[model samples]
Target: SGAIYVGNYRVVNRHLATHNDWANLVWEDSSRDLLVSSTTAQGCDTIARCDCQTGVYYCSSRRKHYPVSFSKPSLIFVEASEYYPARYQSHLMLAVGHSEPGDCGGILRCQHGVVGIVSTGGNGLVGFADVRDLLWLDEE
Candidate 1:
């Protein structure tokens, strides 16, 4: 695993919900600049856009991990395929399709605004942690 720096914050992987197939990282500090200008809590059957780094690919010969870096910000599009309601143990999460690898923690934005956080993805499907649930937790 590697570390990512966002503005004044150093974010590192912190938690993983393996049963729900979602994970989150901890940020060292908070900043107004880090907030999305506009955001929403809904994303079902919507065409969402994301800009994030794809997962790294490892090379055995060189014994190195190479991340997919972009010269310019890259945009990826995917559809919110399904919404899984919060269960007895699991929190709400969205099921998206056509997402690329290494999109976890990327903002999932729809026409309205932000909706979810990219969590885990594979086999043409991706999981997103619902932003509404996260916000509720913050309020609590």
Candidate 2:
């Protein structure tokens, strides 16, 4: 059955697909899962809350803030341009913080993929990909 899709914020973006500060499409869904509508913007750091139970309860979680992380999660629909790194390549590099939400430099993780970590500086920055590459997991 269809349900409610609510959020604390609209999770909107600020620009097109070539510059920074671009916020990709994000919204709370009826299934209580975060939805990626499109990847238009670049660095949009927004958070939203959704109805996890019966589509009623909601909480605000920080949004994706950088191109690196943004680039990862983006792999869900788009493919990377290259091996990533040195800017010579056009791939999403997984980033990890060290003591806070978005601090402590970064590390190049999973040449290309989506992000599923908790925090940036701590043990929260975890990326999730299918056991198999070359194919989408959901497709299996």
Candidate 3:
């Protein structure tokens, strides 16, 4: 269970993987833990919500966002073109946010890689990756 907190948001490893197909991928809300303003969108300035919404409960002690969401109408997944900085090692594939929810600056962490730390950000602005870098672990 990759249970960690970034500001007031919580990110778990449980619902990180997107099914087995991107062809029909559907962003679910079953176990949401991260909810930011952007995930590689326009403008700049990442802002992580450490407080509750207008009519929501304070997430001071939560594991993740159950109903996470974001807005990026001008973005699209373009394989290697759309990058979410990541590293591959033995059994870990860590990723860091780039410039989607621009504001919180960014992250400064790594082992297989490093993401510079920032003073602000959000769930959608944060970076995420599959633990099992399939391509990196492939034997060919």
The TM-score values for the models, in the order shown, are: 0.32, 0.20, 0.18
- Name model 2 segments beyond 4 Å from true: 1-35, 40-97, 104-108, 111-140
Model 1 collision count: 1
The TM-score of candidate 1 is: 0.32
- Count the clashes in each prediction: 1, 10, 21
* Worst window of 10 by summed lDDT in candidate 1: 29-38
The lDDT per prediction is 0.32, 0.23, 0.24
Once superposed on the true structure, which residue ranges of model 1 sit more than 4 Å away at CA?
1-89, 136-140
Indicate whether candidate 1 or candidate 2 has the larger lDDT.
1
Clash pairs, candidate 2, are: 22-41, 22-42, 22-43, 97-120, 97-121, 98-121, 99-121, 117-126, 118-124, 119-124
Model 1 Cα displacement at 45 (Å)? 22
Tens-place lDDT digits, model 1, residues 1-140: 22222222222222322222222223211210122211123222222234432433332323443333221121223333232222221222334243443444454444433444444444644444333322322321
lDDT of 1: 0.32
- Which candidate achieves the best TM-score against the true structure? 1
Query: Per-residue lDDT of 50-138 in model 2, one digit per residue for the tens?
Result: 11111111111332343333223223222221221122211112233222323212222232322222212224432221111212212
